[PDB]
Amino acid sequence: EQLPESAYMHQLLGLNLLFLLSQNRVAEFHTELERLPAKDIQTNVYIKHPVSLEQYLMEGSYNKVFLAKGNIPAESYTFFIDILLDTIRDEIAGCIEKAYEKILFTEATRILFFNTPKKMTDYAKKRGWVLGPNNYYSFASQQQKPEDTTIPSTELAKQVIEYARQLEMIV
Amino acid sequence: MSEKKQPVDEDNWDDDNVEDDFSNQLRAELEKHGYKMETS
Amino acid sequence: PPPPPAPQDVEMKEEAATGGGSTGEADGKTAAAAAEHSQRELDTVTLEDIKEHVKQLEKAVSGKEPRFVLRALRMLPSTSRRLNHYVLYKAVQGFFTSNNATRDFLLPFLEEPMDTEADLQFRPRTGKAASTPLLPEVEAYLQLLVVIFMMNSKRYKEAQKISDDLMQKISTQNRRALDLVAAKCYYYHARVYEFLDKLDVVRSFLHARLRTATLRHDADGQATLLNLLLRNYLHYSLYDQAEKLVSKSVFPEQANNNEWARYLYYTGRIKAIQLEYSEARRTMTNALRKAPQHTAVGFKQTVHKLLIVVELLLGEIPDRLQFRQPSLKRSLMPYFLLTQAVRTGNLAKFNQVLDQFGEKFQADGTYTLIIRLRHNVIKTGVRMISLSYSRISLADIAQKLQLDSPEDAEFIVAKAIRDGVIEASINHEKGYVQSKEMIDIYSTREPQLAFHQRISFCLDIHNMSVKAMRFP
Amino acid sequence: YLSKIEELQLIVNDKSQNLRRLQAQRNELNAKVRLL
Amino acid sequence: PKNPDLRIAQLRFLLSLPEHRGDAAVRDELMAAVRDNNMAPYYEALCKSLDWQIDVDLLNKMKKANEDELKRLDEELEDAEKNLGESEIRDAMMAKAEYLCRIGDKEGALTAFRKTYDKTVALGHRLDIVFYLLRIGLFYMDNDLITRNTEKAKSLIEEGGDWDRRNRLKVYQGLYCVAIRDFKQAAELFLDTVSTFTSYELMDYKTFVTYTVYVSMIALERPDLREKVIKGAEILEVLHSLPAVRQYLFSLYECRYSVFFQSLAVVEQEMKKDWLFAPHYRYYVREMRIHAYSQLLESYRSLTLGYMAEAFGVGVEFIDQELSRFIAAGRLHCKIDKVNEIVETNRPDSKNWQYQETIKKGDLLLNRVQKLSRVINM
Amino acid sequence: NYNKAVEEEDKMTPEQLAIKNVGKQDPKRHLEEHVDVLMTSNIVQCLAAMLDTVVFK
Amino acid sequence: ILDKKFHGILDQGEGVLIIFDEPPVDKTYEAALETIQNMSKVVDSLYNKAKKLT
């Protein structure tokens, strides 16, 4: 380990971390927070900016993306922040009406960006979507009408079969 | 049983459990809770 | 010279049981484990860990280890006369002059029970002869003429690995004594190896030592060496938890009943540091209620401070004071105000507890707490207020918790729907939440869904008490 | 030494004789409860 | 011979909480020092009160008079023990030596309590012991005194006991149960009210009337409420000299709430200004408020803050933090809305939690007894 | 209601098992006769809950 | 209602009083409270347990 101090050390961790942040990992983020923790808060903007940036991403701001993109080339993180724009947009494809009433053109313009390409039109013609009259809905019921069968009885009757069966053969 | 890593490692105090269920809540203040009558 | 008779007595009471009795419990015994003197000897090792072991000072220097390691011989039935030698050598400490013959002269003393005669065939006497002298040497780690000798004594214990691996040549189950002693002494291996530096090829020692205990003798070795390996990967950088994710073979009889408890604690710290709330807090809970006793002073306490870090990260925790040792109070001077900062929603205090106690937070060393504890504060806010009111506004809660704008309150409510706590939607014109609580959710067929698990769990424990009733 | 572990390891399975020692003792117990 | 020293409890609390009268304690307690020759009203006022410009000579000449009474005791004890009397001179010295503990510091306690502590022989030689350690444990902030001497009295003095003095022990235990906020037991032990007119231990039986109302307003149920202060009058005479207490209990029986603000503010003024309450008052306010709020919501369901603002005034964002932290304090099962303005009364008892509590006990209890049955193998 | 009214006197036995050290000649066992009745009676009730889902299809 | 002479729910929003009641379920009450007493008795057997162990 006693090597000469690596030149691109600060941003190879950042390349890996921003790639991880692009591919939506859940625990390699924290083994990254464990392998070299002491150089994260004091210094190393290539790491100090992505980790508080992640705090801001799961704080509730996709606009800190652009506040940050004020300055993040950081020797070709440009492809990775393009994949970060992609993980903005497909997480909009998820989180645009998770359990919302309805949005309109202007909330598309706020949460989405690039006012109207054929890409939000592609969303409206790609996810099974009703482009209402300057208006949006997930569906006509948004939940596909949950009753689940209207029979909770006979499956738990089979459960009673193997349940009484396991209470049998034992004392 | 010390066999692990560890060989390096209700006077006013159970009232403090309900009081730390109360510490962010109305210390005494008694005037506020008596002067909320007469502002209307 | 009147106190050293107490080590003179307990020393003979130990190796009487160990040598003669567990050798007779090894000759033909151990149907499952009839070596009850093995657990008796681990009780006496805990007894030598309570007391001074035998000869650390004991008002003299170096009496028993040059004495009793001679002349075992296992022969014609007058070897109780060699025991009489062992007993009547004890005029030297009381009457004669004591002399220093430990930690330097032990190097042929360990070879004396082999160079007397072909003593016997079993390895627990050899593990005795290299453990019962040398475990009284390890707990004096003053790093001057004592730790290089712990080092070499456990190199003789690595020779005990060699004579654990190539003795009885297959299937004599003396591992239910030597792994029982080797759990302890391999923890002391890791202790003395990491009192100086991290251990590097001792990792492969531990790997192959886990390998050799795979199927032929899979009794108390795999889980304990896996605790060693787990705390190895815990103290240093964190790369090989994917090894447990791909090779999860971690299920013995869970024999020592506290080894499994602290094992679940350590892997709860693992899943706490990987990423988990639910499964990690339930195995922390199971290790918490699987605290064996409180017969060991304040050892649950620091480890519990690091245990319920995830419950602090829940946000649904009150003050934790029922655990508090008063000798832990001067160390939880940060931690008491930290759970107070959990109960409070202040932001300047959320960072001023950090600005006040970052050094003890480094003593924790687990800033995964602070990377999500602000998010925990806003989730505490959303759980409280979203359980409180049916149709709240996002502006009320927002500018009650200083959010200053509608759209980040929208992102909060949206990521809370994404995190799934309440139904709460937005009367979309400029925000202004239209929402509801949830009573009349369900209450009758849904309990009896879980009652299958209730009573199937009960009948599992019925049959377990049946298979435990089988033991007498 | 190939198969020469397995029979002695099935002799390690002979707690069946002790759990059934309790069972055969209970056989005797309640059978002579009955006969009594 | 307890009541001026229970006023010393009153007055050490006067030194403790009210700093609005920062020397009224040393005023009437230095008067209580220059009468009865009590020297602890400037021992502990030398410790905890002011820094004493000059009262040295004019009170240490009476410390010499304290020594005069103390040494005529310390000569009466040997010049009287000549007679063949079983613990008689011991009783004559314990009376005036625990009265010296009334006079002086814990030197009086160590030469009195520990002296007539061991060789006790009779009903009075342990009755006076338990009561005269109960005095000083009630005076200071001690707990082992007032509880463990009563545990001794339950061991020693009883053997089944008398009819009165066991109820006096109940009065003392109910006074700890009002010192701590033990709600049910304070009123349960203050139930009787037949044998405590005024002893030498009651400087104010009307303070016993305050102690029974100040816990009966919480713990006592509503059929119990009518059963105590409607079906019976034996407390209602001595609090029909105190009509606003009767008025507050009948308004509690009525549900009118602005007079709850009024008279609960009266009780909370006294709750700051009565001892054995100062580590404990914070729970009281919101507890009585929610004790009314439960039956308030038990009225009906489609309630508001206007029909309740008639009773509350401007209880609009008062009830924001008030009722929301009643919701978040694990209390007050309800649902509440802002502009649709729902209120909810709910919880029928045969629903889920009474079904839940069994495995709530016997999961931790389960694996407890399971690991206790896993110590058995190895 | 049988299976509660006799269960309270069933649980009047472990208080009698608290003999703190030992003060009771032999187990004097009243565990049984309320295992088996509950067992087979609620086997009958659960298979009766089966019976409507059995006869109907 | 608070004196149990009148079992139901009033209203202020829609102005609709509705009387109904069903308190007693001993299937829940007697069973579960006797289980609470059972658990207290098992805690009383926890010292037979803690006595046979140590």
CA distance B20 to chain E (A): 11
Angle (CA) E206 E208 E209, round 5°: 60
Q: Does C269 touch chain B (CB under 8 A)?
A: no
User: Which residues have a Cβ under 8 Å from the Cβ of E110 and sit 6 or more positions away?
Assistant: none
Gap from B2 CA to chain E (nearest CA, Å): 17
Question: Residue C398 in 3-state DSSP?
Answer: helix
Is residue C249 less than 8 Å (CB to CB) from chain E? Answer: no
How far, in Å, are B20, C198, C265, E182 from residue E320 at the CA level? 20, 57, 42, 29
Beta bridge mates, G8 = G19
Measured CA angle at E233 (ends E232, E236), to 5 deg: 130
Indicate the residue of E328, E364, E374 with minimum beta-carbon distance to C388: E328
E215-247 burial string, b = 16+ CB within 10 Å, else e? bbbbbbeeeebeebbeeeeebbebbeeeeebbe
End-to-end CA distance of chain G: 55
- Contacts of A79-87 with CB under 8 Å at 24 or more apart are A80/A15, A80/A18, A80/A19, A80/A21, A80/A22, A81/A18, A83/A19, A83/A22, A83/A23, A84/A18, A84/A21, A84/A22, A86/A22, A87/A21, A87/A22, A87/A24
- Dihedral of CA atoms C308, C314, C317, C320 in degrees, nearest 10, equals 20
Helical packing angle, A78-94 and A9-23, nearest 10°: 20
Q: Does A156 touch chain F (CB under 8 A)?
A: no
- Nearest C-alpha of chain C: how many angstroms from B22? 10
Check if F4 contacts G (Cβ < 8 Å): yes
The answer, for G49 touching chain E at a CB cutoff of 8 Å, is: yes
Give the residue from chain G lying closest to E348, CA to CA: G23
Orientation of helix C175-193 relative to helix C36-50, angle to 10°: 30
> Can chain B be said to touch chain E, i.e. do they have 3 or more Cβ pairs within 8 angstroms?
yes
Chain E contact for G28, CB < 8 A? yes
The coordinates were experimentally obtained by cryo-EM
Whether the CB-CB separation of E367 and C286 falls below 8 Å is answered with yes
How close E377 gets to chain G, by Cα (Å)? 11
HSE-CB for G47 with a 13 A CA cutoff: 11
- Are E365 and G36 inside 8 Å of each other by CB? no
Query: With an 8 Å Cβ cutoff, is B39 touching chain E?
Result: yes
Residues from chain E that touch C292, judged by Cβ atoms under 8 A, are: 371
Q: Cα–Cα–Cα angle for C152, C155, C156, nearest 5°?
A: 95
Q: CB within 8 A of D1, min separation 6: which ones?
A: C169, C170
The tokens for E282 are 């914070």
Which residue is it, tokens 């060393």? C365
Q: Is the minimum CB–CB distance between C393 and chain E shorter than 8 Å?
A: yes
Burial of C139 (0-12, 13-18, 19+ CB in 10 A): middle
CA distance E150 to E199: 18
Contact C433, C400 (CB under 8 A): no
G29 → chain F, closest CA residue: F4
Structure tokens at C120: 């016997």
Q: Is the dihedral of CA G24, G27, G28, G29 positive or negative?
A: positive
- The CB density around residue C6, as the number of other CB atoms within 10 Å, is 13
Which chain C residues are within 8 Å of A170, Cβ to Cβ?
459, 462-463, 466
Residue reference for tokens 């829609």? G14
How far apart CA E268 and CA C139 sit, in angstroms, is 61
F contacts of G32 (beta carbons < 8 Å): none
Which residues of G make CB contacts under 8 Å with F?
A: 26, 30-31, 34, 37-38, 41-42, 44-45, 47-48
Residues followed by a gap in chain B, C→N > 2.5 Å: 9
A14 and A47 Cβ atoms separated by less than 8 Å: yes
Start-to-end CA span in chain E (Å): 64
Q: φ, ψ for residue A93 (rounded to 5)?
A: -60, -40
Instruction: Please state, in angstroms and rounded to a whole number, the distance separating the CA atoms of residues C127 and C159.
Output: 10
| Three-state SS letters, C324-388 | CCCCCHHHHCCHHHHHHHHHCCCHHHHHHHHHHHHHHHHHHCCCHHHHHHHHHHHHHHHHHHHHH
**CB spacing of F47 vs A163 below 8 angstroms:** no
Nearest to C137 by CA among C109, C160, C103, C111: C103
Contact predicate C416/A99, CB 8 Å: no
Residues paired with C434 in a beta bridge: C425
G2·E299 Cβ contact <8 A = yes
d(CA C165, CA C217): 11
CA distance C276 to C310: 8
Cβ–Cβ below 8 Å for G11 and E355: no
Residue type at position A76? S
Q: Do F18 and G48 touch (CB under 8 A)?
A: yes
3-state class (DSSP) for residue A135: strand
**Backbone dihedral region of C433: left (phi > 0), alpha (psi from -120 to 50 degrees) or beta?**
beta
C-alpha distance from F30 to closest chain G C-alpha (Å): 15
Tell me, yes or no, if C28 comes closer than 8 A to chain D by beta carbon.
Answer: no
The first and second tokens of residue A36, run together, are 């070299």
Q: Which residue has the tokens 């009397």?
A: E85
Closest CA to E273 of E29, E18, E9: E18
The CB density around residue C122, as the number of other CB atoms within 10 Å, is 20
Terminal-to-terminal C-alpha distance of chain C: 46
Interchain proximity E337–C390, CB inside 8 Å: yes
Show the tokens assigned to C86.
């062992």
Q: Which residues of E touch C255 (CB under 8 A)?
A: 377-378
Q: Do G11 and E368 make contact, defined as CB atoms within 8 angstroms? A: no
Any CB–CB contact under 8 A between A62 and chain C?
Answer: yes
Touch F-E: 3+ C-beta pairs under 8 A:
no
CA distance A46 to E316: 50
Q: Structure tokens of E281?
A: 């008052």
Cα-trace Rg, chain G: 22
Show which of residues 116-145 on chain A sit within 8 Å of chain C, judged by CB atoms. Answer: none
* Contact exists between D and G (3 or more beta carbon pairs < 8 Å): no
Supply the DSSP symbol for C426.
E
Buried b (16+ CB within 10 A) or exposed e, C387-407: ebbbbbbbbbbbeebebeebb
C211-219: long-range contacts at Cβ-Cβ below 8 A with a sequence spacing of 24 or more?
Answer: C212/C165, C213/C175, C213/C179, C216/C170, C216/C171, C216/D5, C217/C171, C217/C173, C217/C175, C217/C176, C217/C179, C218/C252, C219/C173, C219/C175, C219/C176, C219/C179, C219/C255
Q: Write the residue in G12, G42, G53 that is nearest to E302 by C-beta.
A: G12
CB atoms within 10 A of CB D17: 10
The secondary structure of residue A5, as a DSSP letter, is P
Burial of C54 (0-12, 13-18, 19+ CB in 10 A): buried
CB pairs under 8 A, 24+ apart, for F1-5?
F1/G26, F3/F34, F3/F37, F3/F38, F3/F41, F4/G26, F4/G30, F4/G31, F4/G34
* Mutant choice from F8, F21, F34, F38 vs G, greatest count of G C-beta within 10 A: F8
Place of tokens 């508001």: E304
Instruction: Please indicate whether, in this complex, the C-beta atoms of D1 and C170 are within 8 angstroms of each other.
Output: yes
Q: How far is G11 from chain F (nearest CA, A)?
A: 38
Contact C262 B23 (CB under 8 A): no
Q: Residue C153's closest CA among C122, C208, C204, C192? A: C192
From its phi and psi, is residue C420 left (phi > 0), alpha (psi between -120 and 50) or beta? left
| Closest C-alpha among C194, C102, G19, G43 to residue E368 | G43
Task: Report the SS3 class of residue C181.
Answer: helix
Quick one: resolution in A?
4.9
Determine which of G48, G51, G52 to mutate to test the interface with F (most F C-beta atoms within 10 Å). Answer: G48
Q: What is the CA radius of gyration of chain C?
A: 29
Quick one: which H or E segment has residue C118? none
Nearest CA-CA partner of B21 in C400, E290, E283: E283
**Which of G10, G28, G39 lies closest to E300 in CB terms?**
G10
Any idea of the CA torsion for C135, C141, C147, C149, to the nearest 10 degrees? -30
How many beta-carbon pairs under 8 angstroms link F with G? 26
From the list G1, G28, G35, the residue facing E299 with the nearest CB is G1
DSSP C434: E
Cα–Cα distance, C256 to C227 (Å, whole number): 13
Asked if E145 and E134 touch (Cβ cutoff 8 Å), the reply is yes
Q: Which chain F residues touch G38 with a CB distance below 8 Å? A: 11
Q: Can you tell me which residue has the tokens 């009203």? A: E41
Which of E146, E77, E154 shows the shortest CA–CA distance to E111?
Answer: E77
Q: What is the DSSP letter of F11?
A: T
Q: Cβ distance C407 to A110 under 8 Å? A: yes
Choose the mutation target among C361, C382, C407 for the interface with A, i.e. most A CBs under 10 Å.
C407
- Contact status, residue E338 vs residue C389, Cβ threshold 8 Å: yes
**Residue F56 one-letter amino acid:** F
Q: Which residue of F has its CA nearest to A155?
A: F53
CA C231/CA C265 separation, integer angstroms: 11
Reduce the secondary structure of G1-54 to three states and give it as a string: CCCCCCCEEECCCCCCCEECCCCCCHHHHHHHHHHHHHHHHHHHHHHHHHHHHC
C136: number of Cβ within 10 Å = 21
Residue among B9, B20, B21 minimizing CB distance to C299: B9
Task: Compare CB distances from C31 to D1, D9, D15 and report the shortest one's residue.
Answer: D15
Does residue C188 contact residue B5 with C-beta atoms inside 8 Å?
no
> Choosing among B2, B4, B17, B21, which should be mutated to test the C contact, i.e. which has the most C CBs within 10 A?
B4
